[PDB]
Amino acid sequence: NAETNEITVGITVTTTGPAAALGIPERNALEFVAKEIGGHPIKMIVLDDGGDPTAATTNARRFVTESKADVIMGSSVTPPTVAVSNVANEAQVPHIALAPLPVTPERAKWSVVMPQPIPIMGKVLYEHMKKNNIKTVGYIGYSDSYGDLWFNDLKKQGEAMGLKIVAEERFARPDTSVAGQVLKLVAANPDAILVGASGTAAALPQTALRERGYNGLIYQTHGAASMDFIRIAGKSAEGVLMASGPVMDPEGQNDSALTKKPGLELNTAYETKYGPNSRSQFAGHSFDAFKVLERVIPVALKTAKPGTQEFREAIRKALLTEKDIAASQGVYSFTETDRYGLDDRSRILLTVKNGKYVIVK
Numbered sequence: 546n547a548e549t550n551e552i553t554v555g556i557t558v559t560t561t562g563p564a565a566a567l568g569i570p571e572r573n574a575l576e577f578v579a580k581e582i583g584g585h586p587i588k589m590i591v592l593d594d595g596g597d598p599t600a601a602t603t604n605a606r607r608f609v610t611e612s613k614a615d616v617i618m619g620s621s622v623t624p625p626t627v628a629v630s631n632v633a634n635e636a637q638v639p640h641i642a643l644a645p646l647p648v649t650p651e652r653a654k655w656s657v658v659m660p661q662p663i664p665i666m667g668k669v670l671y672e673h674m675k676k677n678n679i680k681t682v683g684y685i686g687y688s689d690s691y692g693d694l695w696f697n698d699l700k701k702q703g704e705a706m707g708l709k710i711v712a713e714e715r716f717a718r719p720d721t722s723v724a725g726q727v728l729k730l731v732a733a734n735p736d737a738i739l740v741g742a743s744g745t746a747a748a749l750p751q752t753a754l755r756e757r758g759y760n761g762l763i764y765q766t767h768g769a770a771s772m773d774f775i776r777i778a779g780k781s782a783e784g785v786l787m788a789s790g791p792v793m794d795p796e797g798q799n800d801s802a803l804t805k806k807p808g809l810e811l812n813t814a815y816e817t818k819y820g821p822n823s824r825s826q827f828a829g830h831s832f833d834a835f836k837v838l839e840r841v842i843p844v845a846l847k848t849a850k851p852g853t854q855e856f857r858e859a860i861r862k863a864l865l866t867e868k869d870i871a872a873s874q875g876v877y878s879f880t881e882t883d884r885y886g887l888d889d890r891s892r893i894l895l896t897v898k899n900g901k902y903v904i905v906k
C-alpha cells in the first residue's frame with residue numbers, strides 16, 4: 546500500500562489461441578500510448594491469457610498481490626473479461642474492460658468498458674434490416690455470454706422493431722466446423738442471418754453459409770471488425786453488413802467530430818508500422834483505455850500518489866467526474882450506473898466490397 550514513482554498498469558490480453566486476432570492488435574497499439582502521465586512513468590505488465598477465464602483470473606490476481614497495479618485492463622474477449630472484472634471488483638482496483646461484458650451491480654463500481662454496448666450496435670443492424678425488407682432472421686453465435694448478449698438483443702430490440710427470429714444456432718469458440726448448425730439455418734431459410742462471434746471465428750459461419758448455398762444477407766457484430774475477418778472469409782465476406790466503431794473511418798468523419806483526431810493519431814501510427822488498412826476495432830480499444838487514463842490520472846494525482854489505495858479510489862471517482870473523454874472509438878462519459886458511457890458517435894456501419902471495408906451511408 547506504499548507510494549511509487551511509476552503508475553502500474555496490469556494488462557491481460559489474448560495473444561495466443563482462437564482470439565489472438567483480437568489481443569495482438571491490442572498489445573501492438575500499446576507502442577503508441579503515453580509513456581508518462583502527470584510526470585509519472587507508466588509501467589505496463591502485459592500478460593497473455595489465451596482467452597481462458599482461469600488464466601485471466603490468475604493474471605488479474607497477480608496484478609493485485611504481486612504487481613500492486615494502480616489500474617488493470619483486459620481481456621480481449623468476454624469470458625476472461627468477466628473474470629478480470631470480478632477480481633478487480635473484489636480487490637477494489639480500477640478496471641478498463643477491452644471486451645464487452647454484462648456489467649451487473651457486482652461489477653459496476655470498479656469496471657468501465659471500452660467496446661460499444663451490444664444494443665448500440667444492434668440498433669444500426671436492425672435498422673438496416675428493416676430498410677432492406679428483412680422480416681425473418683436466423684442467428685448463429687457462441688454458446689457463451691457474448692453469444693447470449695447478442696441473441697438477447699436480437700430477441701428484445703430486434704423483435705420490437707418487427708423482425709421475427711426463425712432459427713437459433715450456437716457453436717463453441719474452438720470449433721472448426723459449423724456444418725450441422727449451418728444446415729439448420731439454410732433449412733429455415735431466413736431473409737437474413739446475424740452471426741454473434743468475433744475475429745477469425747466470425748469468418749467460420751460466413752464461409753460455411755456461402756458454401757452451403759445460403760445467398761441471403763449476413764450481418765456481423767463489432768467483434769469481427771479487423772482485416773483478419775476478410776483474410777479468412779475471402780470471397781464469402783462480400784456484401785456483409787457489419788457494426789463497427791468510428792476508428793475504422795476517421796477520414797470520413799467531420800473535422801468537428803471529437804473522435805476524428807484520436808482515430809487519425811492511432812491509425813497513422815499503427816498503419817505506418819503495420820501497413821495500409823491494418824487499422825482495427827481492437828487496436829482502438831487499448832489506445833482509448835490510455836486516452837481515458839490521460840484524463841483521469843492527473844485528477845487523481847491531486848488527491849493521492851501512485852501505489853496507494855487512495856489513488857485507486859481517486860481514479861474511480863475521476864471516472865465519474867471527467868466527462869466527454871474524446872477517443873478513437875467514441876466520446877466517453879461514465880456514471881455510477883452507466884459503465885460504457887457511449888452514444889451515437891461511437892458507431893458506424895461497414896460492408897465489404899472487393900476485399901475492402903466500405904462505409905454504408
Ligand SMILES: O=C(O)C(=O)Cc1ccc(O)cc1
Pocket residue numbers: 567621622623624643644645660661691742743767768769826827830
Ligand atoms: O468474443 C468476445 O466475447 C468479444 O467480446 C469480442 C469483442 C471484442 C471487442 C469488441 O469491441 C467487440 C467484441
